[PDB]
Design a protein around this ligand. Structure first.
Ligand SMILES: CO[C@H]1CNC[C@@H](OCC2CCC(F)(F)CC2)[C@@H]1Nc1ncc(-c2cncc(C)c2)c2cc(C)c(=O)[nH]c12
Length: 127
């Protein structure tokens, strides 16, 4: 079984805007999480082929990762901050769905998520 194509990251048939919340999600939230010591497994789609996890995309039908989030922010793919926040949440929930609760990767994800939520609770007000 091969990997599915990545999530869509660019669409010209979608309206474009820059907002201070979206800027903050890229420049502060994504940047912070990306540099975190546990970020590495979440920086690109799960390569189920390379990792030998043939069951991954049988279980995870809404894949998401921070590489995809980065491209989406870069390409002005999101109109609303909540679209991006949803993608971060999808990434975390996917990890919790797929892996056993005691797995190293789950505990790593939990630490990343704690950080994520700290940065999200400080989301600047709509300018
Ligand atoms: C069936 O195994 C999965 C569930 N248990 C936890 C992880 O198990 C340890 C790996 C070790 C390496 C292996 F090849 F032998 C396969 C078992 C497994 N889940 C996951 N394993 C690896 C990754 C990962 C992806 N990219 C880079 C790295 C360094 C690791 C991931 C990543 C995510 C997001 C995930 O949900 N599960 C993973």
């Amino acid at each position: 079984s091969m990997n599915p194509p990545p999530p869509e990251t660019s669409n010209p048939n979608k309206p474009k805007r820059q907002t201070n919340q979206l800027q903050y999600l890229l420049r502060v939230v994504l940047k912070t999480l990306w540099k975190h010591q546990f970020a590495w497994p979440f920086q690109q789609p799960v390569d189920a082929v390379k990792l030998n996890l043939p069951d991954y995309y049988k279980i995870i039908k809404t894949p998401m990762d921070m590489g995809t989030i980065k491209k989406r922010l870069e390409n002005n793919y999101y109109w609303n901050a909540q679209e991006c926040i949803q993608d971060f949440n999808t990434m975390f929930t996917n990890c919790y769905i797929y892996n056993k609760p005691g797995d190293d990767i789950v505990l790593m994800a939990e630490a990343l998520e704690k950080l994520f939520l700290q940065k999200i609770n400080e989301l600047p007000t709509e300018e």
